[PDB]
Design a protein around this nucleic acid. Structure first.
Lengths: 92, 92
DNA sequence: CCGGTGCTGAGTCAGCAGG
DNA sequence: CCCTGCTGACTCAGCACCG
């Protein structure tokens, strides 16, 4: 009957408890349940939107940190290649 | 009465002078309508900014991932070159 | 001390995409 | 044909400014 109980019980459990009620009330209670559930759906939707904003802004940092790590790696190899190439061309 | 577009763009000084003579109920009603219409567009901009922000972030992460892909290919090319010269050098 | 403003959280409804 | 879960869009509440 109350909002917390109405939103908690299943429509299967609802129809059984709704037995003995006017057809006017049954459709009225069922639509009250939907409203309360949409309230919860809204909370999840807004929360998800936030989490997705964070994992994007976080992935951006996980990539920037990787890019900088890789630019250092090419600097080591480029220098190391130049070393071998200079030593090689010297021997023709 | 009046239009929505004019009712929103109007300044308070113009709007007040525009309803000199109207009943209190109508004045309050019209004022509430201006607030409602404003809130409608506020939410429109907010969701707009949210979407635009989201698209900016995604494009950055796509550029970064592409950049990482480039660098990964680059170290693979430099390492192969460095090792190739090693073999040619060690021989001669 | 009042009122208009811009913003944003939360609630509502429509309507779409699946159980 | 319902029901579910979700999301866009409107509304209001309430805060933080402002004039």
């Amino acid at each position: 009957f109350s909002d917390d109980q109405l939103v908690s019980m299943s429509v299967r459990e609802l129809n059984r408890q709704l037995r003995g009620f006017s057809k006017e009330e049954v459709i009225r209670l069922k639509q009250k349940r939907r409203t309360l559930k949409n309230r919860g759906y809204a909370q999840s939707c807004r929360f998800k939107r936030v989490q997705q904003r964070h994992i994007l802004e976080s992935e951006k940092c996980q990539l920037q940190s990787q890019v900088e790590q890789l630019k250092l790696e090419v600097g080591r190899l480029a220098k190391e290649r130049d070393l071998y190439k200079e030593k090689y061309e010297k021997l023709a």
